[PDB]
Amino acid sequence: GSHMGTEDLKYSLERLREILERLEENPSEKQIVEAIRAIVENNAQIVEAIRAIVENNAQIVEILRAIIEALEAIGGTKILEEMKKLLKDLKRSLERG
Amino acid sequence: MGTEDLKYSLERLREILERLEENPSEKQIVEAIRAIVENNAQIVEAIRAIVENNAQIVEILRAIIEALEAIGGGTKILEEMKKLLKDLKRSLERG
Amino acid sequence: GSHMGTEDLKYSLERLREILERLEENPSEKQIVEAIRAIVENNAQIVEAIRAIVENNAQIVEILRAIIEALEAIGGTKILEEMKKLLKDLKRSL
């Protein structure tokens, strides 16, 4: 269901190992399918986690930009130019949708 | 985080997929599933390390805003950074 | 083929869901390998996205590293000393 955090990944991962145990001991077609249904369900929760992390990175970028502005308004420099370069580069290579 | 264990896991999974496609067998299917579970293990671990590192980044951002406030006081930029940071805190990926 | 962003995971995951529905309705050895194939594809996009995020993480830490420098040159401290510790831990992790 709705994603609550990384602990969701653990509970689906550990349940994934439980299904694997049943598989190695008592193989069966229905069980191979069961394990695949579980992997899918596990992957859908991994995507949500990565999605949320990507949005967090985007928000962090905006905060870093505002910090640069505040630093420029306060102290007016070489380091400031260096930071803006990194932020530009990060903006260019940022993982997004 | 570190990604070698991830790529090392994915490459093995890739090769295992090759055999299964070549000689579809129950043992090879199970061998592939075991590899996927192991790949998802490194994935989930790498995601956990990114989340914990973000949490510390959020804390460093808080200290930064304080260091800026101690030097400069009330600015529109500060209300902006704080409002932004609060929105990042409400939506941070957590446990 | 070429990783373009998290939208790639969403699409491949949806293909993977689609391959599952057929597998479950009418199982067979063909669809099983089809499903696994799609899992490896989705996992590959996932690893790529994660690899890019870890890269972003490194660049962010550098920007914070340069900021703390800028703060030191401007205002001389405890909070900076505190910020240097958090960063050191974070730099150690990566």
Author numbering:
A (entry chain A): -1 to 74, 76 to 96
B (entry chain C): 2 to 96
C (entry chain B): -1 to 74, 76 to 93
Task: Quote the authors verbatim.
We used de novo protein design to generate very closely related proteins that adopt two very different states—a short state and a long state, like a viral fusion protein—and then created a single molecule that can be found in both forms. Inspired by class I viral fusion proteins, such as influenza hemagglutinin, we chose homotrimeric helical bundles as the fundamental architecture. We decided on a design scheme with two divergent conformations containing a constant six-helix bundle “base” and a variable portion with three inner helices and three “flipping” helices. In the compact “short” state (∼66 Å height), the flipping helices fold back to interact with the inner helices; in the extended “long” state (∼100 Å height), they extend to form interactions with each other.
The interaction energy between the flipping helix and the inner helices in the short state was tuned by combining hydrogen bond layers (“A”) or hydrophobic layers (“X”) in different orders in each of three possible positions. We constructed all eight possible permutations of two different layers in three positions, dubbed SERPNTs (in silico engineered rearrangeable protein topologies). The number and position of the hydrogen bond networks appears to determine the state which is populated—designs with one network folding into the short state, with two networks, into a more dynamic short state, and with three networks, into the long state.
